[PDB]
Assembly symmetry: D2
Homo-oligomer: 333 residues x 4
């Protein structure tokens, strides 16, 4: 129902578009990318090394990108304030380039007639939402918002359930994360982040992440109670979170399993998964959950100190949450 | 000085043999491996995908393996009780096949004339030793011992320093671990451990490990205070430990850095390393430390709750510790 | 329609089973594998790192493996002459273990009541067949046959078309081949084939193959005119043939493209594919063609000397050809 | 003797610098790279994922990069015509950015006082030289020259020997090539070469190359007689050439081995290697040969039609040839 524009046709832009057409919850009507012409867009959308060939039809016709017979207007503007979203009918714009994450910069899309802007990344100052956690705090006065990061969307739903039931005193998170586009095939320049320049095929690479701290924004009672770090490893997709936390109320591991499984079947269905299967990362490729609790992999030292494991398709889970968030916003109009 | 036999000419058997000849601390005089004949041993020892070509000479001569001009008796026995270690002059035997890790099974080497046996792996019942941590507890009545695991040798020196200075109330460990010979190139059978059969090149694979619990055997005061788990990831060598612990006495992260650095320059020199450089895993390939604390990668939530990161070459550090252990044993005879 | 037993539930056994149910062309009614019990079979068949979760249902019930509601008798015999195929109603048996590839050994399945045996690998003595090339030479007198290799199934249909139209004077093939189960995660023992023991993740590994020579068996006119070799590279699936040949009749590259495309739309439809897209190996993952000609990738030096490139999913193409061969056999009785 | 500046401190720029300090044949006195400042250069030079830590000392002092006690002037200019090479005493400049490969663009270094320029890549118009093949055709009138590509340096020495002894009528080349810095970690934009944008970890990627045709420039008698293509595969370093050629004179494979071994021990020593060992790509990491003939890997169809295999460390062999070529140029002044 709501008509959507996508700024950037990178991994996130293309998979948000894919999720939109797969789920049908929103209608994509425009895309902007200065570095990718129409014929090339067709190729990049249709073929995907990680998620396979698109399920449906894609073609160029009359200067438009036509996906499942739905024509999409293509822009090639470097300056977001110059994109004519309004003339194309785009109401919501997904800001997925990674370089306009502030209110100031993302807000440029409004000048072109966009009504609201969803930043598909953390923002220094735009309000952040995580589906299943605080999305009900959204309201119509908000024209520029953020859907946080893939890792925060993994951690927050699980932290919510654990905190609601047992109370997190403090927690430290590690994420073992699949490689991304910001990394390098061989040792190359990454001036602000030296480790991240090192060859991605050859190395386990430690990295900082604000994702754990960010959970404190979407779950205010956990402000200051979580932090963490990441390791990048040479897999193409799917990542995993390891949350080590101290609990205030006693929590037998079997009681933890019960409340997570109950959450996965009710209010967080589709967002927080639960499995007891002997899974490995490839079993979550193209999985649309934000977070899937791995009952078998986690371990408790005692009833107050536990390590909890949750898998996430860092591409597909997040992409589908952007769509879900827009669908929720549209329902509130 | 002490003459050594190696059972199992694998990753660890070969690299123990390299360490012995590179350091000169022990003399290898016999090798048994029923799945590698003499001419094949020359090839497997000389060329190493991970650590490069052997620096030295290796050839087959008169039915012996000759390394740097030293002849080595070669056995081809499946049954360890049948290996004639005594005839070859092997006084200590490194049990590095992976399949004889109880005192009962490893003790078979005594029937062929070995005086002592060092199991290159955790043992359900053999006393375990970690160089720098409890090796001075070894005494001459122990004919069969264990050098623990690569992961225990990483965690224990660091845990020793943290516990000695601040005390560890409780800790949970994750290791991000390189692939090993027990894993599979593509999805295949592993009936006792289903996740471990899944393709190692494609997957992040959670795995159980007793390594953190074993730290409580080499540091008795930590008995019951540590446990953990592992993720196998697609790198051919070098692993990393992530220790999340609660301290009984408060420490600023700078205090922790100070005492670890001091330990690495003094009593744990060569065993525990310390760095502030922007390292990645390949920077530790062929590094002979048991453990190298990564000061920049770690993070503290508060003065009592911290995540400490330490790197280890799981092949090369451990192999050198096996040699160091035997040298220390021989000094006690 | 024909009822089928599978000996060995491995990459090929499982994917033959998956192809049978996906296509519906034969009915699997029995499976034997001593190293994978019933509950483990469910897991190994349902989850696949390479091809994703099975599209359908799989469970254990009443001692049977049930796939899409169809019950399958499960055997656990090490000795093929003891498998009761007849009692389970299996008429054809796919011998996919890799260790019974001679007529003498594969013939053991006839003792337990199977009528015909199809060896899913080259055989020293069983007649070999490639669908689209010589399958019409099959006849009802043949009780034990071979479906050749994945590489032979890629090369032969392409060779057939080129030879039929232009005449191959001589040809040399290279295949760049994905890793397989016979390879090793780290440098390990492979006594008959030393290079194949070297770590698969770390190495390009040259290997001998009789695949090109074997084309001269399924296309007798090409006996002695083709041979080749392979390079194993660190990808989990999908391989590619590079055929360099001298042609007797002049052949502009556009003429080669024309006759290959024509073949792909006619007698070889589903076996030999044709593309002009800018493809890479992952675009062929789960592609059921034996061979897909890459028009853009090949190159001609002149009208008589050309290099032709053809892609193949070595797992899925071959599996589907085993099923197609059995369906063809069944149509003759 | 000759003093050298390096433009572009990348894989080749850094390894040229390493090769220069290791061999002592030339003196590096200046480096330009606008994307790598002085402190970062220390780090990038000292640590190398592929070739390990620099053996020697490296530090920043007084605004100079100091390698083994030798100070190097550091420039940060995007525009090559603005680099003050003369002031720094740099007589020859290695042009290794990958973006100034024509004589007109590379000639910009003369404006800042360089005397000669060596392009570390093929050039559309600069004369190309391969050490051991046509470097004696260099003369003092050539102020801007090219060292060709890594692949051309592998193929040309081998082709010289084969052509000299047996005569190459025609040949077709495939190179199975390690990934490079121009490739992408995950599917991303490569608008001119779509396949090259596809994830390098996940894919075998076909690519065009002028390397075989270029052999016809450095060996004029082979003009028009060779072409070829490449497959990029997921390994971080070391590549291999597969040369399929028709010979005019009969050449038993043992005779081919004889004359290649002879060349490797005499006129082409240090450039063309020869092995009969069971090698794999990692055995050539940091190998300084341009080309190493793999006797056991090649195969003959008959006396006039053969496939010859040669390995090359695409980073390290080539970097050493750049240094060798500059020292030879200096000897002609
Ligand atoms: N690889 C590491 O990082 C590492 C580190 C610490 C400890 N370990 C442990 O060392 C031991 C060996 O591990 P690995 O990585 O070297 O494995 P590996 O497979 O590379 O080597 C084991 C070997 O022993 C041989 N062997 C098998 N059965 C034998 C028998 N009956 N008699 C004699 N030889 C036999 C095999 O042919 C092979 O060479 C294991 O217990 C392992 O858990 C490994
Ligand atoms: N994987 C490919 O790309 C491919 C392609 C074409 C042909 N092939 C051929 O198919 C055959 C199987 O190859 P794979 O890739 O599936 O290897 P695999 O290791 O995955 O399969 C072998 C299976 O056979 C089982 N097995 C072993 N011994 C057995 C016995 N006595 N009785 C019953 N089952 C037994 C094993 O448990 C295993 O599951 C080989 O001959 C191979 O050359 C493989
Ligand atoms: N890597 C190989 O295997 C190999 C082998 C032979 C030749 N080459 C060729 O050598 C050249 C460099 O290749 P590479 O693999 O080292 O790539 P690279 O990306 O690792 O290095 C390029 C370097 O040049 C720098 N640079 C970019 N623009 C610059 C500018 N205007 N001025 C100064 N520096 C600039 C970059 O920061 C980078 O450090 C290319 O032409 C390549 O084709 C590469
Ligand atoms: Zn306190
Ligand atoms: Zn036979
Ligand atoms: Zn019938
Ligand atoms: Zn000084």
């Amino acid at each position: 129902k709501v008509k959507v524009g996508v700024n950037g046709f990178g991994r996130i832009g293309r998979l948000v578009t894919r999720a939109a057409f797969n789920s049908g919850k929103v209608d994509i009507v425009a895309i902007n990318d200065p570095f990718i012409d129409l014929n090339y867009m067709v190729y990049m959308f249709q073929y995907d090394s990680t998620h396979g060939k698109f399920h449906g039809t894609v073609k160029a016709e009359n200067g438009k990108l036509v996906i499942n017979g739905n024509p999409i207007t293509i822009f090639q503007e470097r300056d977001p304030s110059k994109i004519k979203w309004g003339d194309a009918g785009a109401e919501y714009v997904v800001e997925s380039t990674g370089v306009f994450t502030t209110m100031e910069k993302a807000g440029a899309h409004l000048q072109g007639g966009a009504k609201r802007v969803i930043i598909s990344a953390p923002s220094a100052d735009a309000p952040m939402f995580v589906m299943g956690v605080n999305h009900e705090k959204y309201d119509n006065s908000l024209k520029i918002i953020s859907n946080a990061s893939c890792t925060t969307n993994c951690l927050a739903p699980l932290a919510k359930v654990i905190h609601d039931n047992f109370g997190i005193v403090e927690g430290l998170m590690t994420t073992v994360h699949a490689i991304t586009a910001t990394q390098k095939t061989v040792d190359g320049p990454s001036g602000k982040l030296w480790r991240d320049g090192r060859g991605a095929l050859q190395n386990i690479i430690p990295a900082s992440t604000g994702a754990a701290k960010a959970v404190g924004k979407v779950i205010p009672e956990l402000n200051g109670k979580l932090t963490g770090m990441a390791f990048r490893v040479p897999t193409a997709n799917v990542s995993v979170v390891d949350l080590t936390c101290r609990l205030e109320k006693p929590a037998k591991y079997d009681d933890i399993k019960k409340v997570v499984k109950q959450a996965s079947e009710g209010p967080l269905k589709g967002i927080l998964g639960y499995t007891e299967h002997q899974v490995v990362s490839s079993d979550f490729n193209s999985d649309t959950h934000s977070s899937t609790f791995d009952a078998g992999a986690g371990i408790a030292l005692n009833d107050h100190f536990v390590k909890l494991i949750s898998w996430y398709d860092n591409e597909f889970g997040y992409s589908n949450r952007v769509v879900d968030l827009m669908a929720h916003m549209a329902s509130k109009e």
